[PDB]
Structures are given as structure tokens and as C-alpha cells.
Design a protein that fits this description.
The structure is a homodimer of 190-residue chains.
Chain A lengths: L1 H12 L1 E2 L4 E2 L7 E3 L5 E4 L18 E4 L7 E7 L6 E7 L16 E7 L3 E4 L5 E2 L8 E7 L4 E6 L5 E4 L9 E6 L8 E3 L3
Parallel strand pairs in A: 1-6
Antiparallel strand pairs in A: 2-5, 3-4, 4-15, 5-14, 6-11, 6-15, 7-8, 7-14, 8-9, 9-10, 11-12, 12-13
Bound molecules: (2E)-4-hydroxy-3-methylbut-2-en-1-yl trihydrogen diphosphate (2 copies).
The site of one (2E)-4-hydroxy-3-methylbut-2-en-1-yl trihydrogen diphosphate has 8 residues of chain A, from loops.
Chain lengths: 190, 190
């Protein structure tokens, strides 16, 4: 059973992350749920303080915990949301000015545009071919081997693995949404 | 550098397998080189014994040693070949009658058809998008987690990961070539 083997694999090798959204980091156009599990976009930017930790250009928010070591996974209910990008980024990313979200710029993210265009946000972007659109996505980090990978968390099918790299400093769970859609992104608890 | 990270990741996690081909398993249309590292195809079936372990239908050959446990990798020079498939199969796969080469039938393989069509031999087959056609492919096995994955061995880019599974019995390196063409399939030594 592919669900069973996915469950047994993630349990054997990856620490289960309990990820909550940090509204202090969130671009002003983002709405973070009271339980800090769910992410929607506002109509327009809210008036929030431009504290140094807040994303002011990218429509990004971070988790409340970073990783400097170990294997970690978390799963995100993306449901039928037609646009979303998730993964990890370095503590030291540019949060204020425009930069391309690329591994070179400290972002390892994949996701969906316009309902049907899956991409890895590599440089240049990798067009994914996804036979079964995921409803829940597992994010898998191995700090020591520089590994960031993504799976369909319902059927265990692989989506994308970045080239193995070298990480500098802490890695944060990162979430980006560009559009207004009925379906929020929701983090599954550990 | 992605090559260096690829080298450090296989060193951290995977035991380098020294794979040689077992000519007694090779379909009678295949030629195994005397050093048992290279594979070619004949114009017709040659006259060989139909010993039980020989693939009579599928243009396959196994390695000389199996895996019942652990993390293992080997790399295969596919060069400019227009057709090839490689991966692992269970000891108990059908050798004589036709079976579809699928995980359900005990086969975990990916490869190339008609020079440009990269596929995983899932059921259904998964169409791959590969930006840089590999000359050398890394095959990565984790027996315990039921993981088979494939990399471009030269630049470290990921090709394909099968859904995690549960293996039954020993796994063998398997190699398949269907075409009569100038470039051999060559295994890289450990
Ligand atoms: C406006 C915006 C993001 C769009 O960035 P880009 O337009 O660079 O596109 P992508 O390839 O999706 O990163 C806010 O995060
Ligand atoms: C004739 C032959 C193999 C072709 O099998 P199939 O025609 O099932 O094709 P594939 O999807 O490539 O496995 C001998 O191994």
C-alpha cells in the first residue's frame, strides 16, 4: 500500500515538524488564521508595521521555527487552490527588495499557477508534469545532505527533488500565495 | 557546486555497489562484455541454454549480487543511446512468459525511448520532463524504506523517484536495451 509505505518512510527517517505561520513575517497582503495553520490573501495590503522580519515584496510568510540540522517533514492541504508555492528558505533571504525566488537567492519552493501549471522555482523555472494534482503536499528537508523534496501526501507519489546543495544558516518553512481564491492553504499538525 | 553536493550525499547515505552483469540471466539477444560491465544487442537471438534464471522474453539482464537490506547506488553510462531502461527488480519476477515491466510485477525501472521520450515504467507509465539529457545515470536503492530513485550522475539533477513501496525478497540491478545501435550501456565501477 503506497499510503502505508509513504507513512512508514516519513516516520522512519524524518522528524515530524509542527509548523505554525508567524504573522510577524507575513507580507501585509497575507491573512494568517488565529490558529496560525491557515493562509489566505487579502483584497489589498493591510496597514502593518514594516518590522525587519516582515516580507515586504514577496507574498511570503515563514513558520515560527527554523532548522539548522536534521531531517524534517510537514504536510500542507493545498486542496483545489489554483495558485500556491511552498518549501523552505534561508534566514538571510532578501525580504524587503525584489529578488527571484531561486535556490541561488536562498529559496527552495515548488507549486501551482493558473490551476494546472506545476513548477519548481529553480533558475530557470522547471515545468513539472503532474499526472495526479495533489490535494496535500509533503515537504521533506534533509539539512545535512542539502535535500529538499516534495510528495503527494495522499498517494505517496513524488513531485520534485531539488539538486542536492549546501545550506547556509537556518531554514524556515515558507509559504507564498499571489491570488484571491476561496480555498486557503492549511498546515496539517504533526 | 551541485556535483560536489551530489558526491557528498551519496557518500553520506548510500553504499557504492560494484555491479557486474550476469551473462546467465541475459536474454539470448543480449551480449555481455567479457569484463561484465557493458551490454549490447545482437541482430537476432543467439543460441543459449534456456536455464531458469535467463530472461527469455524481456531484453533484460541482472547484476551478479542482490540486495536484501541497506542503501546502495550504482551509476550507468547511457551516453548517446536512443533507448535504454535500468533499475531494480525482485528475484521472483517472471523470466519466461511476458509480464508488463511494472512495480506491481516486481520491476522499478526508468529510461529512454526514441532518443527523447523519458519515462518511468510505473503503471500507467509516467512521462518525464528532463531539461538536460543524462549521459550517466545514478540508481539509488533504500531497501528498508522501499525507495528507488534516479539522478543525472554528472550534474546531480533528480530524474525520478518511485512511490515508496514494500519490497518482497531480494532486489537485483536490472538493465534492458531494445535497440541495435552503436553505443553500449556501460556500468561505472564503484
Ligand atoms: C509578485 C510576487 C511573485 C511573483 O514573482 P515572479 O513574477 O518572479 O514569478 P515566479 O516565477 O512565480 O516567482 C510576490 O511574491
Ligand atoms: C519487447 C520488450 C519490451 C517492450 O515491452 P512493452 O511493449 O510493454 O513496452 P515498455 O513500456 O517499454 O515496457 C522486451 O523487453
Amino acid at each position: 500500500e503506497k499510503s502505508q509505505a509513504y507513512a512508514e518512510w516519513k516516520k522512519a527517517l524524518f522528524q515530524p515538524a509542527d509548523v505554525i505561520l508567524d504573522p510577524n513575517t507575513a507580507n501585509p497582503i497575507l491573512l494568517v488564521s488565529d490558529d496560525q495553520r491557515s493562509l489566505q490573501r487579502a483584497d489589498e495590503r493591510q496597514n502593518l508595521p514594516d518590522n525587519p522580519e516582515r516580507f515586504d515584496w514577496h507574498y511570503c510568510v515563514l513558520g515560527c521555527k527554523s532548522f539548522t540540522s536534521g531531517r524534517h517533514y510537514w504536510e500542507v492541504e493545498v486542496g483545489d487552490r489554483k495558485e500556491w508555492h511552498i518549501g523552505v528558505c534561508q534566514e538571510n533571504v532578501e525580504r524587503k527588495c525584489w529578488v527571484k525566488m531561486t535556490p541561488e537567492n536562498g529559496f527552495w519552493t515548488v507549486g501551482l499557477t493558473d490551476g494546472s501549471k506545476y513548477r519548481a522555482l529553480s533558475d530557470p523555472r522547471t515545468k513539472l508534469t503532474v499526472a495526479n494534482p495533489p490535494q496535500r503536499v509533503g515537504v521533506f528537508l534533509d539539512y545535512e545532505t542539502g535535500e529538499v523534496s516534495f510528495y503527494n501526501a495522499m498517494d505517496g507519489s513524488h513531485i520534485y527533488t531539488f539538486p542536492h546543495t549546501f545550506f547556509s544558516g537556518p531554514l524556515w518553512p515558507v509559504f507564498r500565495i499571489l491570488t484571491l481564491e476561496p480555498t486557503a492553504l492549511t498546515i496539517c499538525p504533526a
